[PDB]
Curated annotation (Swiss-Prot), chains A, B:
Domain notes: Has 2 AAA ATPase type nucleotide-binding domains (NBDs) per monomer, a low-affinity, high-turnover site (NBD1) and a high-affinity site (NBD2) with a 300-fold slower rate of hydrolysis. There is allosteric regulation between the 2 sites. ATP binding to NBD1 triggers binding of polypeptides and stimulates ATP hydrolysis at NBD2. Nucleotide binding to NBD2 is crucial for oligomerization.
Induction: By heat stress dependent on the heat shock transcription factor HSF1 and the general stress transcription factors MSN2 and MSN4. Expressed at a higher level in respiring cells than in fermenting cells. Expressed in stationary phase cells and spores (at protein level).
Encoding gene (name): HSP104
Miscellaneous note of the record: Present with 32800 molecules/cell in log phase SD medium.
Modified residues (Phosphoserine): 171
Superkingdom classification of source: Eukaryota
Phosphothreonine modifications at: 135
Covalent link location (Glycyl lysine isopeptide (Lys-Gly) (interchain with G-Cter in ubiquitin)): 78
Residue ranges the record marks as coiled coil: 48-172
Family statement: Belongs to the ClpA/ClpB family.
Name this protein carries in UniProt: Heat shock protein 104
Length: 181, 181
C-alpha cells in the first residue's frame, strides 16, 4: 500500500489528540497498520462492482434454469429467458475486464512490494558488508545493485499511470491518505 | 407465532426505558423470547382452556371410575355417573375439534419451520453461488426447490385463512402483542 508522508504526520498528531494516554508511536502506527490492512482488504474484491455483477449473473442462472428446464421452455412463457441470457453476456463482458483490470492494479502493488523488499535486502547486506569493512560486497550493493532496484521502484511507481482524471489510470486507491484514510 | 412489528419496537423501548440491569441488545431480545414464550404458554393455553374443561372432564372421569363398577352399579345411586357422562360427551364434542385444530395449526407451523429451514439452507448454497457465479449446483436448487418451498409457505398462509369468527382460522396464532404481551 502506498503511504503518504503526511499520513505519518497526521497519524502521529491524531494519535496524541484522540488517544493522548496511549503510547504515541504505537498508536500512530496501529492507526496506520490497521488502515493499511483495511484498504488491502477492500482491494481483494472491489465487490461493489464485482459482487454486484456476479450476483446479477447468478440471478440470471436461476431464471435460466427456472425457464430452461421445462416443457414450457418452448413457449414464450419461458422462452422470454433469452433476454436474461443476453444480459448474462453483457455482465460477463463488463465483469471480466473489471476483474482483470483489478488484478493488474493488484499486480502493480505486488511489484512495488517486492521491489522495495529487494532493495531493503540489498541494504541489509550492505550494512553487514560495511561493518565487516568488506569493500567488495559493500561496493556490489552501493553501486549499481541498490541504484538498480531504486530505479525499478521509481519506474513501478510511475506504472500507476497517473492521468489528469485521477492519481493513476487505476480505479482503486490502495493508499493511506493523510486525513481521509 | 406471528409477532407484531410494534412488539419489537415496544420491547426495545421498554428495555431501554425501564430495564437498566441488562444491556439493550439482549434485554430487548430477551423481551422478545420471553414475550414469545409467554405467548407460547398463551398459545398452549389452547390446552390450558381445553384442559380446564378437561379438569371438568376429570372430575367426571373420577366420578365415573368411582361409580363404574360395584355391587350396586346398576342402582341410580351409582348410575348417576351417566349424567357426568352426558357432560363428558358435551365437553369432548367441543374440545376434541378445538384440540385437533390446535394440532393442525401447530403442524401448519411445523411445516412452515421445516419448509423455511430448507428454503434457507438452499439459499445459503445459492448465496455461495451468487457471490462466485456457480451456475450449476446452486442453480439446480434455486430451480424449483426454492419457489416450490416458497409457494408451500404461501399455501400454508392460505391455511391460516382469516375468518369472521376469529382473525386467523389458525386461531392459536396469538400474534405477540406489543402492548399486552
Amino acid at each position: 500500500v502506498r503511504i503518504l508522508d503526511s499520513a505519518l504526520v497526521t497519524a502521529a498528531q491524531l494519535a496524541k489528540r484522540y488517544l493522548p494516554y496511549r503510547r504515541l508511536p504505537d498508536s500512530a502506527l496501529d492507526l496506520v497498520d490497521i488502515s493499511c490492512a483495511g484498504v488491502a482488504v477492500a482491494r481483494d474484491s472491489k465487490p461493489e462492482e464485482l459482487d454486484s455483477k456476479e450476483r446479477q449473473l447468478q440471478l440470471i442462472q436461476v431464471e435460466i434454469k427456472a425457464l430452461e428446464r421445462d416443457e414450457d421452455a418452448d413457449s414464450t412463457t419461458k422462452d422470454r429467458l433469452k433476454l436474461a441470457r443476453q444480459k448474462e453476456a453483457s455482465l460477463q463482458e463488463e465483469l471480466e475486464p473489471l476483474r482483470q483490470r483489478y488484478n493488474e492494479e493488484k499486480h502493480g502493488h505486488e511489484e512495488l512490494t517486492q521491489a522495495k523488499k529487494k532493495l531493503d535486502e540489498l541494504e541489509n547486506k550492505a550494512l553487514d558488508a560495511e561493518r565487516r569493512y568488506d569493500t567488495a560486497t559493500a561496493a556490489d550493493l552501493r553501486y549499481f545493485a541498490i541504484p538498480d532496484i531504486k530505479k525499478q521502484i521509481e519506474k513501478l511507481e510511475d506504472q500507476v499511470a497517473e492521468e489528469e482524471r485521477r492519481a493513476g489510470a487505476n480505479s482503486m486507491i490502495q493508499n493511506v491518505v493523510d486525513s481521509d484514510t
